Design a protein around this ligand. Sequence first.
Ligand code: HEM
Length: 173
Amino acid sequence: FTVFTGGDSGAWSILSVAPVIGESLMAASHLAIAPSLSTPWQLRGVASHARYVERAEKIALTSVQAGLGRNEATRAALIPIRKSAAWWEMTQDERRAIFEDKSHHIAASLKYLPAIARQLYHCRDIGEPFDFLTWFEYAPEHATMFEDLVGVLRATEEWTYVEREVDIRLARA
Ligand code: HEM
């Protein structure tokens, strides 16, 4: 379990919290991130195994992607997301087709690496009010590229299934 806590301390100060769809989150000054085996808000998720990635895609990703904790990557984003019942009712082949064949989530995002490093956390199965916690780190000079990527994905068929989403932006403290 990785716990994201909006509060008065932590490795990240919070630049901004803005609504995207559905209910937003309360303001806080800092974000702490920490492992755990079990305040304005607190959110938890789990880094997990691949649900959609195929081998050729994994190869393509690992060849360009960067890791967390880069000295220059002093800006970050946390985007909590919940998809609709209609999404979760669909079968695996139908979700994969929307995710990649129609939305090209992977193929269209590859150009943004290595600039944008990412980590995905899953939390539907632990009863959290979101389904995913998406975490991104980048240099200040790539922030406009980052907001551009985000706007691109938010225009996709995949995103028509998002029913709650919040925009949190951070600066390394
Ligand atoms: C920076 C470039 C990005 C790349 C290379 C990328 C790549 C991926 C990959 C390969 C997966 C699937 C993991 C799996 O097989 O389970 C994924 C899942 C996901 N990504 Fe992205 N992503 C990027 C940016 C973003 C952004 C900016 C967001 C949110 C605004 C986002 C939201 C998500 C979500 C919610 C999932 C889970 C999809 C699901 O399982 O229903 N990604 N991403």
